[PDB]
Structure formats: C-alpha cells, structure tokens
Design a protein around this ligand. Structure first.
Ligand SMILES: Nc1ccn([C@H]2C[C@H](O)[C@@H](COP(=O)(O)OP(=O)(O)OP(=O)(O)O)O2)c(=O)n1
Length: 370
DNA sequence: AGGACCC
DNA sequence: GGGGTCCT
C-alpha cells in the first residue's frame, strides 16, 4: 500500500493577492508589510535582493523603489486561501492545510481510479507532466513510476484550475508521502512542478544542508541536535537511536529519525472548517491598560463578524498577552451559554477584562467550536 | 496553561 | 508579523 500525495504551495501568496487587487503593482517590485516587517514580496522584488521577513528598515535600503502594501489584516488572504482548498477538495475530499498557502492532497484513490480506466496499450503512452526530480529515468514497467506520473498529471490539473478559476499560480511536488512531497515541490519555483521517483529519495534527502531544513525539526529541536554534534541529515540518520531517545524522548526521537531517511507514515488529514479564530495586534508598549481595553474592543468587533459568517458557535474564549521582554500568556474560560447567541460585545468585554486582570501584544481567540 | 511545530 | 495545528 504505497500512496501518491501532492503538496500544493502557492507562490509569494500575499503579494499575489495584492497584485490581483491592484494590477498596477504587477511587474512592479512588491513587498507586503506588517509592522516593521516585510513579510513576503513578489519575484520582481526578490531578484533585487529582497528576502522574506526582511526588515522594512533594510529592505528599502536594498531597494529604494520597492512598493509596499500593508498586510496586517488577513481577511482577503484568508478568504482566497479557502477558495484554493475548496478547489482542491473538488479533486479529492481529503485535503490538509499547512498555513494559508500550503495544501496536501492524498491522490492515492484517484490515481488508481484513473489507471483502472486505461487499456494495456495507452498505458505505455503515460507521460510525465513537469520536472522529474534529479532527471531520473522513467521506467514505464514500474508500477510506482506509472502512479507517480498519473499523480503529476493530476497536479498539473489542479495548477491549471487554480490559475484559470482563481487567477493564482503556484508549485506542486508529487511523491509517496507528505515529507517528500513538501521537499520536492520547492525544487523548481516559481510556478513549476516536480515529481519524485523512489530511486531519488536519498538524493533529495541528502540535498538538505541542515536538519533544521526538515519539516518537523523546528527552532528548538535543531538546537538540541546541534548541541550533540548532529548537523547533516546523515549525522541524524547515523546517530545512535538509543541516545537520541534519552535526550528528546522516544516520541520525537523515533520520528525525526524516520524523517531523516525520507520516511513519513503520517496520513493527510482532512482540515475541514477551522478549529479556532483569532485576531492579533502587536505594539511597542501599551500600559494605559484601559486603552488596553480598546484594543480588546477592536479585536472583538472583528472576530465577532467572522464567527457570525461561519454559523458554528464557539464555547470557549481566550485572552493572550506578552510582557515587555528582557513568552506569551493566556487565560481561558467558557463562553456563558446565555451569551452564545450569535448586545454580545457588551457582555464579552467584561469576561475578557477580568481575564485581563488575572495577569507588547494583545490577542483574543475563540475556540471549542460546536 | 503552556509547549512544540507549521506557514 | 499574524495567523494556524496538535500534544503535554
Ligand atoms: N514564517 C512565516 C511564513 C509565512 N508568513 C506569511 C507570509 C506569506 O505571504 C505566507 C506564506 O509564506 P511561505 O513561506 O509559504 O512563502 P510565500 O508563499 O509567501 O513565497 P514563496 O513560496 O515563493 O517563497 O504567510 C509569515 O508571516 N511568516
């Protein structure tokens, strides 16, 4: 039972959406701004030495033409993000979202259904769509090559559809599991696709220049390995299981070792509707702590609209803060049943304010949706 | 409640 | 930055 998975990854996503809004920005170098941050930027702008999450500070000093648009309000990028997922759901119901711009679809049932349709003869006419990782030779007599190519044909269709139907371009990687599809999708960008045949899996895995570059291994695990002599993928592949267990837990240990081989048994999960809704707001200090209520009235008013759009009702509220640094904090509590009726801000602002007193950034999160 | 991870 | 997810 070997799977066929596609990882769909949108190009420079926010800049795409802005570029659609204001076409006078197309092929003008564009960065998207949130506070002091240039969060993403278009390819026209990348060429000129802009990188994602560069300071607006430097970024201008590296490009003094860079046209900046404010993207602190995610309403539109969120909305467009869902249209993408929904389009892919039309291909196979089982789409998993990674952030606003990444999607996995498990294509296994679909490829098999396609193959069932073809005869002995047109099975030799099965060709690839896009790049093949590491220029690897197709062997049409290989059942796993055949499926991976049909997989790639499906990916090209998702991509044609996203562009035709939503005006959006992006990348795809096709592979036998989520880790690999995610790694191969980025090999040719922008707006290209790559299929990974199994013989080229070590090659892919070994092209990484650091364990941190593995989806799964984050800021902290990196530092944990780096502090053990482990730096390459092979270092990880060959480190002692037993010792690695003792340091990070049999839980993290045993999975990140699989990962270092290219092995990933984790299923594509159907995302469906969101588990939560939140608004954030960052600032340089707010200690007036009644103005700190106003912030909380803004976050609420907006959040309230979003749940009012959904039609599902949240049963828990959360307030999150951070104290001037020199870690975030949260207080939860249920939403009272009498006030789960969609007047409503008037009672909510108190719940949050006593939650407030029980304690740079203010944040409200609604969760436990029914 | 706070942590690790993702974008 | 401004969002999300699942686990402990
Ligand atoms: N660490 C991150 C990663 C992403 N984002 C935001 C900015 C992006 O518009 C979007 C997704 O980021 P990606 O890393 O997938 O990069 P893009 O899709 O924006 O550009 P590209 O795929 O060409 O690198 O969410 C962010 O704020 N902080």
């Amino acid at each position: 039972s070997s799977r066929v998975i596609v990882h769909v990854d949108l190009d420079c996503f926010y800049a795409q959406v802005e570029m659609i809004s204001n076409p006078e920005l197309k092929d003008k170098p564009l960065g998207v701004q949130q506070k002091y941050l240039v969060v993403t930027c278009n390819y026209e702008a990348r060429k000129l030495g802009v990188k994602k999450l560069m300071n607006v500070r430097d970024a201008k000093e590296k490009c003094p033409q860079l046209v900046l648009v404010n993207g602190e309000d995610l309403t539109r990028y969120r909305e467009m993000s869902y249209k993408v997922t929904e389009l892919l759901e039309e291909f196979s119901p089982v789409v998993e979202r990674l952030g606003f711009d990444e999607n996995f679809v498990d294509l296994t049932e679909m490829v098999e259904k396609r193959l069932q349709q073809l005869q002995s003869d047109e099975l030799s006419a099965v060709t690839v769509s896009g790049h093949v990782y590491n220029n690897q030779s197709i062997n049409l007599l290989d059942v796993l090559h055949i499926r991976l190519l049909v997989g790639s044909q499906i990916a090209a269709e998702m991509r044609e559809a996203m562009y035709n139907q939503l005006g959006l371009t992006g990348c795809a990687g096709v592979a036998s599991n989520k880790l690999l599809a995610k790694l191969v999708s980025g090999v040719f960008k922008p707006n290209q696709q790559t299929v990974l045949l199994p013989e080229s899996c070590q090659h892919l895995i070994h092209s990484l220049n650091h364990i941190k570059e593995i989806p799964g291994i984050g800021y902290k695990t990196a530092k944990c390995l780096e502090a053990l002599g482990i730096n390459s993928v092979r270092d990880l592949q060959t480190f002692s299981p037993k010792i690695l267990e003792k340091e990070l837990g049999i839980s993290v240990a045993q999975r990140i070792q699989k990962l270092s081989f290219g092995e990933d048994n984790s299923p594509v999960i159907l995302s469906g509707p969101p588990q939560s809704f939140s608004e954030e707001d960052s600032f340089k200090k707010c200690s007036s702590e009644v103005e700190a209520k106003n912030k909380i009235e803004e976050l609420l008013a907006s959040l309230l609209n979003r749940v009012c759009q959904d039609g599902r009702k949240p049963h828990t509220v959360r307030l999150i803060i951070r104290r001037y640094s020199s870690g975030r904090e949260s207080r939860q509590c249920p939403i009272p049943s009498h006030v789960i009726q969609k007047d409503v801000m008037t009672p909510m602002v108190d719940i949050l304010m006593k939650l407030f007193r029980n304690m740079t950034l203010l944040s409200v999160c609604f969760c436990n949706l029914k």
